[PDB]
């Protein structure tokens, strides 16, 4: 059993940072078969894809992958930006217990066979710091 999720819910980097690094735990005592989480970035209050990445992949939590780096690729869109931000979900739980990519219904799951230990909203905020006169909107 692994559950995966984010150690921060929100999480803050500069518009010229390039990317942001987000951390995935996993908690479930000790597993070395290897999870598969997929993600993506959700649009959220701009756009994917014309202002920053989405990112799409799966990530491997292999032996030793307690925690997982993932990192979103932030566009060159420069544009008076006032906390825009983006939402990290996560979906499609795979497990790889078996040699084959199917894993039915393997007990070495998140929960049942998938869920997140998030809402699962890893919000990033990217300071555009350019023109970011922003103000403090409670998410
Ligand atoms: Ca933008
Ligand atoms: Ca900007």
């Given at each position: 059993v692994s559950k995966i999720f984010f150690e921060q819910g929100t999480y803050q980097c500069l518009e010229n940072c390039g990317t942001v690094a987000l951390t995935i735990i996993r908690?479930?005592?000790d597993l070395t078969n290897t999870v598969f989480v997929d993600f993506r970035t959700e649009d959220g209050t701009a756009n994917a894809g014309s202002d920053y990445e989405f990112t799409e992949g799966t990530v491997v939590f292999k032996p030793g992958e307690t925690q997982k780096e993932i990192r979103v690729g932030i566009i060159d869109?420069?544009?008076?930006?006032?906390?825009?931000?983006?939402?990290?979900?996560?979906?499609?739980?795979?497990?790889?217990?078996?040699?084959?990519?199917?894993?039915?219904?393997?007990?070495?799951?998140?929960?049942?066979?998938?869920?997140?230990?998030?809402?699962?909203?890893?919000?990033?905020?990217?300071f555009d710091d350019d023109h970011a006169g922003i103000f403090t909107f409670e998410e």
């Open positions: 908690r479930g005592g869109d420069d544009i008076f930006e006032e906390d825009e931000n983006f939402l990290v979900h996560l979906s499609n739980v795979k497990v790889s217990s078996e040699a084959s990519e199917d894993g039915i219904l393997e007990a070495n799951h998140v929960s049942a066979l998938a869920c997140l230990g998030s809402p699962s909203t890893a919000t990033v905020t990217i």
